């Protein structure tokens, strides 16, 4: 996260850290959507261009964290993966279309003051809040500057941007399963996600029932916090049907 700030305790109880067994390192962010399922970006697990292809036994899940490098004894919870599910039509070859993946934990996690699941949007909520100008919140332990890393979870609030503007800021072919967010050059404020934040949740707070909903997933960008450029996120609602399918069948 660039131009963000330290999160307060319990601010994002659904934030998940994808941790590599060996070598032990931060791999990606993710989000807790229930006591047995974790949502993240597909490119965190599969991306041939970089020879990236992880399996269940290469990773660990760390929930309830605040500090990036410390083993938060009695606070965080480390879980193992039972099975991974990459969207069947994940386009890693061209534009990262449908950059989403579900992960099944071996054992259910117990909720606490620091561990709690985020909500998934329904048609109505997506419709009401997914509008340009409306701000969302992104969290991660990623780079603070374009390339130097944070000591603790970072957070930043960013406005959704009109589809046309998003399309005109890049050569990459944009699809309906994406949206971009960030401030325009003439808006004074700034901020963005960056390498290391991948798979992180883009959340909004519903003014109707006061709940937090995950609308996006940190998918891709071109540079970090550059003028005229915006962060792209996987449009979670569009892929909601796939999500439900996997969960109802496994």
């Amino acid at each position: 996260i660039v131009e963000g700030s330290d999160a307060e305790i319990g601010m994002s109880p659904w934030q998940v850290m994808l941790f590599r067994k060996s070598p032990q390192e931060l791999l990606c962010g993710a989000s807790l959507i229930s006591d047995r399922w974790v949502l993240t970006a597909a490119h965190c697990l599969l991306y041939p261009p970089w020879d990236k292809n992880f399996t269940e036994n290469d990773l660990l899940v760390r929930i309830g964290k605040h500090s990036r490098t410390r083993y938060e004894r009695n606070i965080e919870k480390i879980s193992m993966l039972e099975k991974i599910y990459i969207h069947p039509r994940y386009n890693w070859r061209e534009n990262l279309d449908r950059d989403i993946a579900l992960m099944k934990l071996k054992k259910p996690v117990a909720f606490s003051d620091y561990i709690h699941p985020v909500c998934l949007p329904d048609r109505e909520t997506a419709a009401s809040l997914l509008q340009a100008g409306y701000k969302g919140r992104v969290t991660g332990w990623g780079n603070l500057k374009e390339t130097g890393q944070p000591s603790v979870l970072q957070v930043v609030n960013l406005p959704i941007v009109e589809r046309p503007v998003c399309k005109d800021s890049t050569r990459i072919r944009i699809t309906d399963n994406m949206f971009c967010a960030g401030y325009k050059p003439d808006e004074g404020k700034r901020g963005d996600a960056c390498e290391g934040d991948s798979g992180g949740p883009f959340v909004m707070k519903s003014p109707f029932n006061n709940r937090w909903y995950q609308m996006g997933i940190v998918s891709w960008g071109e540079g970090c916090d550059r003028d005229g450029k915006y962060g792209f996120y996987t449009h979670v609602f569009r892929l909601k049907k796939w999500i439900q399918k996997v969960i109802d069948q496994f």
Binding site: F19, Q24, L26, T69, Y71
Partner: peptide, 10 residues
Amino acid sequence: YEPIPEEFAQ
């Protein structure tokens, strides 16, 4: 990073 307890690896 800080080494995490070993009983999580296995």
